[PDB]
Amino acid sequence: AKPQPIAAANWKCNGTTASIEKLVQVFNEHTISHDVQCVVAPTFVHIPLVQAKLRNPKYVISAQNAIAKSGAFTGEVSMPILKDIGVHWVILGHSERRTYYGETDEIVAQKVSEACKQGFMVIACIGETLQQREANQTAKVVLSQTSAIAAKLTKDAWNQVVLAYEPVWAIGTGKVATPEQAQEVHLLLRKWVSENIGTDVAAKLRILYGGSVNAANAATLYAKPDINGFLVGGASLKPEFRDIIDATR
Amino acid sequence: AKPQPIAAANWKCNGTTASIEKLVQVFNEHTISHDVQCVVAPTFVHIPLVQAKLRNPKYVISAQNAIAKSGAFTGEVSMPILKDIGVHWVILGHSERRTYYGETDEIVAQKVSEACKQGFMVIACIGETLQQREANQTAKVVLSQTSAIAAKLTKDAWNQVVLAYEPVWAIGTGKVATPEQAQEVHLLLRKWVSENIGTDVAAKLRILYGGSVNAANAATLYAKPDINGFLVGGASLKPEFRDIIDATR
Numbered sequence: 001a002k003p004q005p006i007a008a009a010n011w012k013c014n015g016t017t018a019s020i021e022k023l024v025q026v027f028n029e030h031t032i033s034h035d036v037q038c039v040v041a042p043t044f045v046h047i048p049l050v051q052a053k054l055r056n057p058k059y060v061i062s063a064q065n066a067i068a069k070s071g072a073f074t075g076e077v078s079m080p081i082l083k084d085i086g087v088h089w090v091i092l093g094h095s096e097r098r099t100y101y102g103e104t105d106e107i108v109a110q111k112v113s114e115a116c117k118q119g120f121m122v123i124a125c126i127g128e129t130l131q132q133r134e135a136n137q138t139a140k141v142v143l144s145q146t147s148a149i150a151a152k153l154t155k156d157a158w159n160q161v162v163l164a165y166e167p168v169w170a171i172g173t174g175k176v177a178t179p180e181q182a183q184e185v186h187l188l189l190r191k192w193v194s195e196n197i198g199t200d201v202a203a204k205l206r207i208l209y210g211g212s213v214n215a216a217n218a219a220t221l222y223a224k225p226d227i228n229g230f231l232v233g234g235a236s237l238k239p240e241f242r243d244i245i246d247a248t249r
Numbered sequence: 250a251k252p253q254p255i256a257a258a259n260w261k262c263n264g265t266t267a268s269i270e271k272l273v274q275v276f277n278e279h280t281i282s283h284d285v286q287c288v289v290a291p292t293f294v295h296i297p298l299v300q301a302k303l304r305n306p307k308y309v310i311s312a313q314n315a316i317a318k319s320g321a322f323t324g325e326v327s328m329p330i331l332k333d334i335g336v337h338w339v340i341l342g343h344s345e346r347r348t349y350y351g352e353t354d355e356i357v358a359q360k361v362s363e364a365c366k367q368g369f370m371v372i373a374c375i376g377e378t379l380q381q382r383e384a385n386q387t388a389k390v391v392l393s394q395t396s397a398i399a400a401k402l403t404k405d406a407w408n409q410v411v412l413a414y415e416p417v418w419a420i421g422t423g424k425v426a427t428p429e430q431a432q433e434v435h436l437l438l439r440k441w442v443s444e445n446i447g448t449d450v451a452a453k454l455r456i457l458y459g460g461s462v463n464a465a466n467a468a469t470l471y472a473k474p475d476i477n478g479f480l481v482g483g484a485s486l487k488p489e490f491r492d493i494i495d496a497t498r
């Protein structure tokens with residue numbers, strides 16, 4: 001049987017108080033009748049607003065990034081500060097942070113390790129570029145990113161980890177991966193975890209697909225055996241996020 | 250006569266809801282009887298809390314960093330999002346961002362330019378390292394950082410700019426610059442602005458000193474003619490921030 005699916009909304013750097021209040025009411029009035037964990041990740045300045053308005057019991061709030069420790073780091077938000085305000089989910093290693101803001105595999109693996117030590121649920125992102133994919137390096141890249149994270153974790157910490165595979169060429173481009181492309185990578189990741197970490201760990205691990213997911217292609221992706229849900233960018237800012245959630249039934 | 254002084258608290262990546270509620274009450278009960286603009290910059294997740302509790306009329310709230318535009322920038326907060334929640338001050342180019350998070354002179358100058366276009370008051374940070382200072386390059390470095398910002402601005406935008414000189418060797422080390430060291434750099438900056446931008450601009454520009462300021466050395470720094478106030482890190486997390494404010498009388 002599949003583990004519990006996740007439908008995660010990453011709002012990236014978007015939103016106004018007016019537009020967030022309306023969308024959150026749309027999420028609140030949508031009744032979800034199956035077992036799914038819904039996740040909303042707003043910008044840091046909107047966490048308090050979302051905490052005050054979001055009432056749907058299937059949802060939790062996540063930060064879009066964090067650093068491990070408080071201190072002299074002007075502009076950043078740390079894990080202890082998020083925990084103190086009630087946030088215990090975080091997205092780490094998003095492609096945009098790896099590309100624009102210098103997060104290497106080592107930096108992402110250290111952040112994931114620290115988040116696990118501080119009790120967070122982590123959504124760790126991995127994925128290849130179009131250049132790597134055309135050079136037939138997809139497997140090597142995704143397994144190198146994953147084993148760099150695995151090297152800093154203990155077996156028990158895998159209980160707090162969610163992997164999100166998002167090919168860089170599918171992010172915000174409208175070119176979603178086919179169900180078959182996504183399933184082959186998810187299967188390869190699950191097998192690697194099964195062999196290197198444990199078969200019990202592999203059976204429970206959620207591996208999500210992200211990159212141009214919308215309400216019409218979600219159900220076809222979710223039909224594949226090793227896809228456990230989605231990380232959604234642009235479609236999570238709209239009311240069709242409701243039908244993405246309902247595609248994990 | 251000096252322009253209106255500024256006393257700015259940069260809380261960096263520190264704070265809990267409990268410790269911020271107590272400190273803000275301390276700031277609220279301190280009556281300020283002279284003309285000074287007080288500034289508090291908390292982490293992004295604490296902006297809403299500080300907005301709800303801070304009542305002292307001499308204070309404004311500032312963000313510790315921002316990006317210019319909303320969009321697919323996971324983890325970042327943009328200028329339009331800050332404006333929408335009521336924040337219209339921002340600190341840019343802090344040494345910690347230049348050192349750890351890759352902000353070059355060009356990146357800082359583009360952020361400052363955009364902030365000015367969007368109507369923010371900006372605290373732009375500049376300063377030399379211990380290596381540059383020992384190599385007698387202080388003047389060259391601080392003027393190169395400043396002219397890189399000046400190149401993207403119009404004369405009228407200088408009305409929204411505050412410069413903060415913080416030698417990198419004085420930040421959080423306990424080794425404050427002497428009044429004479431700070432005054433020589435502030436005078437050099439003011440003259441450069443007077444010659445390259447305008448004498449009217451130079452007369453009104455606030456140039457703050459930062460780096461190990463505390464309540465005992467503040468009054469001696471403020472006695473120098475070209476020092477217009479302070480950017481304070483560690484001492485701004487304590488009740489002695491009150492006497493730093495009162496040293497600008």
Ligand SMILES: O=CN(O)CCP(=O)(O)O
Nearest residue numbers: 010171172211212233234
């Ligand atoms: O964080 C999630 N993603 O980046 C998916 C982005 P999108 O759904 O717009 O292609």
Ligand SMILES: O=CN(O)CCP(=O)(O)O
Nearest residue numbers: 259420421460461482483
């Ligand atoms: O942002 C302000 N500064 O970095 C000054 C830091 P401090 O006052 O701890 O030396």
